[PDB]
Design an enzyme around this catalytic site. Sequence first.
Site, PDB file in Angstrom:
ATOM      1  N   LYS A  98       1.769   7.346 -14.283  1.00  0.00           N
ATOM      2  CA  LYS A  98       2.018   7.651 -12.807  1.00  0.00           C
ATOM      3  C   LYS A  98       1.842   9.278 -13.387  1.00  0.00           C
ATOM      4  CE  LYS A  98       3.035   5.523  -9.074  1.00  0.00           C
ATOM      5  NZ  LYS A  98       1.994   4.334  -8.837  1.00  0.00           N
ATOM      6  N   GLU A 100      -8.720  -0.635 -10.731  1.00  0.00           N
ATOM      7  CA  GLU A 100      -7.679  -0.414  -9.588  1.00  0.00           C
ATOM      8  C   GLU A 100      -8.780  -0.641  -8.292  1.00  0.00           C
ATOM      9  OE1 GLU A 100      -5.061   0.121  -9.950  1.00  0.00           O
ATOM     10  OE2 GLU A 100      -4.262   0.544 -12.279  1.00  0.00           O
TER      11      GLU A 100
HETATM   12  C1  LIG Z   1       1.486   3.499  -8.550  1.00  0.00           C
HETATM   13  C2  LIG Z   1       0.138   3.544  -8.418  1.00  0.00           C
HETATM   14  C3  LIG Z   1       0.318   1.660  -8.557  1.00  0.00           C
HETATM   15  C4  LIG Z   1       1.289   1.050  -8.307  1.00  0.00           C
HETATM   16  O1  LIG Z   1       2.179   0.566  -8.887  1.00  0.00           O
HETATM   17  P1  LIG Z   1       3.384   0.563  -8.080  1.00  0.00           P
HETATM   18  O2  LIG Z   1       4.198   0.567  -9.443  1.00  0.00           O
HETATM   19  O3  LIG Z   1       3.610  -1.081  -7.180  1.00  0.00           O
HETATM   20  O4  LIG Z   1       4.173   1.372  -6.484  1.00  0.00           O
HETATM   21  C5  LIG Z   1      -0.979   0.578  -8.565  1.00  0.00           C
HETATM   22  N1  LIG Z   1      -2.194   1.274  -9.307  1.00  0.00           N
HETATM   23  C6  LIG Z   1      -2.352   2.639  -9.745  1.00  0.00           C
HETATM   24  C7  LIG Z   1      -3.501   3.564  -9.760  1.00  0.00           C
HETATM   25  C8  LIG Z   1      -1.036   3.289  -8.669  1.00  0.00           C
HETATM   26  O5  LIG Z   1      -1.508   4.881  -8.809  1.00  0.00           O
END
Ligand SMILES: *Cc1c(COP(=O)(O)O)cnc(C)c1O
Lengths: 334, 333
Positions: A179, A215
């Site tokens: 992330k 995604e």
């Molecule tokens: C943060 C994010 C998510 C969802 O993650 P959570 O941990 O459920 O909040 C999904 N896809 C992408 C590309 C993200 O950056």
Amino acid sequence: INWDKLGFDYIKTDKRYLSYFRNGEWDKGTLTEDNVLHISEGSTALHYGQQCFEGMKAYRCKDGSINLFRPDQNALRMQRSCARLLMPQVDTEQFIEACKAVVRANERFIPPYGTGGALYLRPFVIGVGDNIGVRTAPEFIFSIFCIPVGAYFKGGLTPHNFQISSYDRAAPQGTGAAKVGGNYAASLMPGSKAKKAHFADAIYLDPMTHTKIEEVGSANFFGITHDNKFVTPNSPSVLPGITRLSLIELAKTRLGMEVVEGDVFIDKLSDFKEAGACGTAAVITPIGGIDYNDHLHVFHSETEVGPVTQKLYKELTGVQTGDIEAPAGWIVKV
Amino acid sequence: NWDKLGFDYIKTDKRYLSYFRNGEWDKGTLTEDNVLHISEGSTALHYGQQCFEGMKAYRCKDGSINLFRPDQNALRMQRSCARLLMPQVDTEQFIEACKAVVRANERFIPPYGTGGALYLRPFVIGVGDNIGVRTAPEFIFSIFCIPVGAYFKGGLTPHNFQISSYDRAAPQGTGAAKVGGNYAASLMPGSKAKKAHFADAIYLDPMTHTKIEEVGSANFFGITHDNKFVTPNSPSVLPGITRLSLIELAKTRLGMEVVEGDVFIDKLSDFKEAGACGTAAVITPIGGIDYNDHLHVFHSETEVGPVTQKLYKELTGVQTGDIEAPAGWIVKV
Ligand SMILES: *Cc1c(COP(=O)(O)O)cnc(C)c1O
Ligand SMILES: *Cc1c(COP(=O)(O)O)cnc(C)c1O
């Protein structure tokens, strides 16, 4: 504060956590009122993308206590994002204690039970200090601020339309499972192009072949098959979401559902009678239709959320708020 | 001491600072403050909304100052900005800001004959209170400078590089823009290559891993046995200004054909020479590339090839004013 009209917008709360990494160690951290960071012009976080973040919520329970949802999972994921960018890791007990201290310091911003609101926490780690030339930074900042948030979309659960993008948020062997800020920067223009075309967001396919869903904007995809299986993409470039993990676990252990983690082909949308996107901010965004090669594929309805999605949303929000007893270890009481 | 100059941050006297707010850039200022004061919610820190540039100013033998092709930086930063939904800096504003930083920091310009230069780092970042991925409500454009020594990667000493299994950029990602996320993706693969005793990682095309795209944060070129200058062309390659300059000089001064095309990893034998080009070092010769646990040697592990020597002579000579420049390349400060 009008709790019902809250969205997902920055509001300055009272205190945030701030901790520096210098000389091989994190300091003990402090709570500060200053929401301005004071960092070198040569910060690697500003020149070479050396940055990562997390997102989690705290909820007021009906009994008046406070649920912080699965912060250990945020800690684990941030350890992996830090490692991928060569940043020092924040150990899990340090991480969770910092989050709890931020919640305690800002309790007056917690929306009351029954408003649908929450207190969102944004931890992040960034490379700072004087530098030039791509390398890991000499110093780092770990900070956490919070904001009161309401429903991400107002009106409740409703279907939204999304558009397949020709662009990539991440490379096949890039940083898509961490992330980190560079994945989002790659999403800015594609997301903007989908919204200018009047869609809620772009959907990203696998970057090597553009044959498989990866995604939905910044959320994970799930489909519900005709035989009621919860299906979600699995690949080295998908971001492993905590909402997705939570839905997988509730589907398997509380709702009597089968889960498939695998390849979701974009030429086979007819496999699903319902579909949605999951993530911390939106919880679940129901997908009404996906536009692909300029045709809108509608799974269930443009106007009504399908029953399986409703049941998943009910279960997950019930656990988050304390109306449904949570699985072991998920809830940290603040 | 100009002799020990490398590529390291030093706080010079003044940097340029300009804010974009409410749809307009301010008029800019020079400040001594090398600390930025930006919101905890800045998109530059959460969503990678940042870009930068790099160019050099050189003291000429005649006492004048050459700023090298700052218009080309201006053009590329405009494209990097557009790709990340940031406001653009028009070419005249950008070049004037660069000249102002040079004039405000002339005492940090290394003298002629040392191989040194004054390196300028413009950058644009999204700032202001925000949460949720979108373009920022405010931006900062800043330019700071540092003195640099051209031999900090060794000069024309060759180095060995190792093909990476990782990607710096996606096929339809931000690889052709000069933004921080590309570097962030390269930190670990570059570190792995260095731990294995290579100078850096080489990145292949991300869709197929059959063609070379980048050498660390430098472009690749090869010189074929029949004296063609070959360099990768793909939507994910960063279009370097050193590469652009070498193409023009190779064609107009060295009488070589340039091919911008595919450099296949199984055709390394086509090249008698190879090198990596970029602003800070100009050219780092490639002695060898390791792929599938075999080291391919081009010319020599200990000596640079003659065509690379002619290219380096011509480009650095133009930069310092020892060789007449092509039209428009040099801005006198
Ligand atoms: C943060 C994010 C998510 C969802 O993650 P959570 O941990 O459920 O909040 C999904 N896809 C992408 C590309 C993200 O950056
Ligand atoms: C910046 C950069 C280069 C070289 O660009 P110059 O304009 O010559 O300095 C080459 N490859 C990558 C990946 C780069 O980021």
